[PDB]
Design a protein around this ligand. Sequence first.
Ligand SMILES: [Zn+2]
Ligand SMILES: [Zn+2]
Ligand SMILES: [Zn+2]
Ligand SMILES: [Zn+2]
Lengths: 631, 631
Amino acid sequence: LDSKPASAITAAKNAEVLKNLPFADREEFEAAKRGLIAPFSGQIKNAEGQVVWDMGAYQFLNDKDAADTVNPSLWRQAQLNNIAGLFEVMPKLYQVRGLDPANMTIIEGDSGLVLIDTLTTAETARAALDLYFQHRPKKPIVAVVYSHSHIDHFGGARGIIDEADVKAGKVKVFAPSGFMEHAVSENILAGTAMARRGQYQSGVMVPRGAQAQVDSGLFKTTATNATNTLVAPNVLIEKPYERHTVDGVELEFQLTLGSEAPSDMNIYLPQFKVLNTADNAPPAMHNLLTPRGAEVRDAKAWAGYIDASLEKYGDRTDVLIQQHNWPVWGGDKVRTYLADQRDMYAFLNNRALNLMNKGLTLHEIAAEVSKLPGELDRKWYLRSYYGALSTNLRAVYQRYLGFYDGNPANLDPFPPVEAGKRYVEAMGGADAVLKQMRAAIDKGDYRWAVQLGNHLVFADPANKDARALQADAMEQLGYQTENALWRNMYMTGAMELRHGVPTYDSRGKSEMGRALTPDMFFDLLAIRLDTDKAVGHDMTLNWVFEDLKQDIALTLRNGVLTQRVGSLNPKADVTVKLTKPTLDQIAARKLDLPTAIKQGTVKLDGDGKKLGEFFGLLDSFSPKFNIVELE
Amino acid sequence: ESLDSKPASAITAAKNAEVLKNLPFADREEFEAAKRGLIAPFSGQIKNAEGQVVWDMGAYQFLNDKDAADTVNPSLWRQAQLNNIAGLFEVMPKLYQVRGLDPANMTIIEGDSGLVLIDTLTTAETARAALDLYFQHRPKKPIVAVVYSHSHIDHFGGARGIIDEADVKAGKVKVFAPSGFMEHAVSENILAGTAMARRGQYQSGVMVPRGAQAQVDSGLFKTTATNATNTLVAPNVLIEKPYERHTVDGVELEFQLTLGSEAPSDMNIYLPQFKVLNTADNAPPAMHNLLTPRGAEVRDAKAWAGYIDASLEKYGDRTDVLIQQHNWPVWGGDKVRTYLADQRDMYAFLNNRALNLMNKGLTLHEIAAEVSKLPGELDRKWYLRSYYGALSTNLRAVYQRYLGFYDGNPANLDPFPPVEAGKRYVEAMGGADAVLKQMRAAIDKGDYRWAVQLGNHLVFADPANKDARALQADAMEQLGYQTENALWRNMYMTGAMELRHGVPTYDSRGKSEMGRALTPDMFFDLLAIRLDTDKAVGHDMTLNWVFEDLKQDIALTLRNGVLTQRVGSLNPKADVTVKLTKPTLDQIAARKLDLPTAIKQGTVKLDGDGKKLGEFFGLLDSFSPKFNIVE
Ligand SMILES: [Zn+2]
Ligand SMILES: [Zn+2]
Ligand SMILES: [Zn+2]
Ligand SMILES: [Zn+2]
């Protein structure tokens, strides 16, 4: 069950990467170290004193070369991602990088500060701003820009600003069209599955070191034991291009909806001749299908938004900045970078669509492609460190055709545990599959080894020999892969196969749900509702929010909850009069239902018994289910 | 080893007879609702200009006033029988419907002077035949207005067979359509086309004969129209508001936009004068697809349920008979209200139950195995059965839509392609003969599902094994005899045929002039897909295109074997400039007119390096929609 070292094959495969890849090009090291005002190599702690962010854990990477247990290209990116701290881009324009998965852009301006993004957590947002104030003059925050609907960009808002100031208009908070709908839907409805699957993407439960967690492509790792916030925006960007001025700072926003995020945009600074591309063009291939789980992205639209940014800003930009990683300097280097980025995404879309039309299936296309075309294979900033070329090609297939390959044999597949049992039987039995698994590792075919091991582990997760072997093979795949996310996944996989899921959650301190409208909260309840127990409990529940002047009519039929915003059922079984702050207290589980009834904060008309009944049919989700085993 | 269509096995016949009990059959409400209003039946053929059969109802005679064969699921046979009720039908005086003369229905509203039509069927020949049958029983009048319910070919396809675009452009004929119709009618139906068209052959069962041992029904219709012409006549008046009231020829029409549900450009049509509601394809008497088997982008079940519910609230109390553009009407306010609420609940369940199980850690296939039935009273409704859409497929689809093809388990991070996996598995299972003995055991046992999984591995490892092919075809055929789903029956059957024989020679979209309506940008996106990256590498160039008749300039760029474009732009340093018109571009696209022939003619004038155009066109691949699916 111990962490096995590099096999003969693995070590040879990694040494091969040393040649046939740049390494002699240090342009990225130059671009990352440039502008460094104050480094960061320490820890960021929570209120309870627990570690949130630790850079000191990645010391093994500093000014050294790759171990046999880590792909050299991954090591290169790992080393770059270690360049943390406060950085000047231009006078009045700074950036805090490496104090969180994302970056915070700090624009000076007339009276206060204009911020682009608020990091992932309140503790990191606060620490980034603390490091900035230690070297720059202390001023308030007049404006905030949410580049897009991702938690690493809005998550730390409440740690540095107040909702009260936003609602009053004292602080101007900009966001692209459809932000609220997306910030809450992609991150909470599908939330608990996303948050647990995201643990494989992060490698958070995996220790740091050359035999374990080393990097996450666009950052080191995810923030631990911290608080995630959601402060509703003030001003929404609805036009394809919108110019705005705040505190003597000119901002041109370019809507990039549906590319890296559903609600997304770029921010050009005409006064500074700098372009900020959010996460639309980072120095690694991005995902078209994120491993934590999400809606597929449109590579065609992504390439078109990069190109539209090249045409509109390319001739007007001296330095390109991002919300992940280092800036690219000089108009010519920015123009090459943009065109390469554009080309990479159009290739993913166009080549896949080409091969689909030739009759190739998702996996067939992943095997056929293997490399980016022409000069795209020699660029460090186009490598498969975050997104994967195989995954992305499969994703374009999913997006245009779907999971189903067209072959009727794959029309109704068997679930993991069921397929695993019949395959193990077909393969000769548990011992036979184990001998075959051992042969595959000896050969160095760890890819085939993991396919056998998955069938056995699901057929019987008790087979401790099958588990240890599949973990050993996965570990070797982790030692081999250039992809940081693939490394974090295989590693999280190998650990849990050997041991299991412990006792932890970072989204536990996260009060994301407080920002939610009744309709958003009821959509959560329609998802939380347990169809099996809810069957035969049909009812209608009117809800009236006096503070909101909003009426909502719920209906529970056939164990399915549906709602009508702005309506009231005339023959409703129960009527629930309350306020949003009281609903929030019951949602946060601070205030109890009968406690609220007695208090007077929840007044009921009709069959009052039906509310408690309804709440008794609501499941609770734990984000610690089995992934490599059997829930 | 035999290649003939095997009859029902002992197990299959027993499994089908079991469906007789545990499913209604004693409820004939649908037979009453289909036979009601029958003015004139239709049981004959509709022919093309060349005299070839387009639509044949006489082929489904084996279904009429008889009970199910052992070789067809009794529920599927029930729907098959209903879909045989073809002809002209009165709904109310001045309100008729032509059903069964095409995959879709045509609603004929009388009115003051002429006729107001809702939809124009799939083909010009069917549109003409429907209108012919109507005029044989009703007074001969012009067509004053046409309504396109949504952007699907079975709804606009036959417009040019009964109306003239000259009359539309003049405003003599009012043609209504929901917001974004043109963009969608042309984009979703002409893009990733060749893969879609070939995969659609499995969905259709067009190459499969008719009969109790082969093709019987297509859920929402009998089959697709053959050897016919598909048309596109641009709409006059666009519905842009969520609800729009319009009056034409003394006919009141209230339109409700249902954008993004069953179709991207979609709507319902209420008839305030008649107290009738027309739901297009938004709520048919079968489960619809969230992911169509021919391949497409996933649909939003949440939005779909919301539009059904909005139609229930707005029209439910004002509607006596609900009509549709596929299948029979539902009569009586109470039966319509129950139908709508069941439909709404079915879609919300798909979305909500899947999201529930995803958050509990269940994977796409695990959720398909756990669900099995719709909740409460939804399992006892004939109109909610899996005849078109499938409950398993749709649950898997909701997983794909919110999370994607990848289950989170790293063992499935990089799966082996079909032929590669098949070889390794067959080897692991003992070899070709061993897998064949195991396959034979699975059929004898009646586990045809497991049999097809083994057979797929063998057929892909060696498609020469004629015994493996015949066996997998035999097991698929039994799955087809067993399935309630009409599309699954068409697929397994197409599968069994090609495994035994192979792919023939045919095309119905050959008489269809749909691709003529393509804008230059749409045509260039096709070229970016047709471009062969491998040969195009090292042929970097820029090509300006100018369309005098369109007053539109488009700037192409070929870099690293990737083609990108900018609509409304012109590259100042372009290698070549191509001045032409859309009708001339169309001629070169249709391959009727040649490139140097056009240059000499004067129809294509060139500036700069004229050599680069011919060079560019030489790098373009050609796709054939007759690739192997099961091989
Ligand atoms: Zn992002
Ligand atoms: Zn980010
Ligand atoms: Zn349709
Ligand atoms: Zn239709």
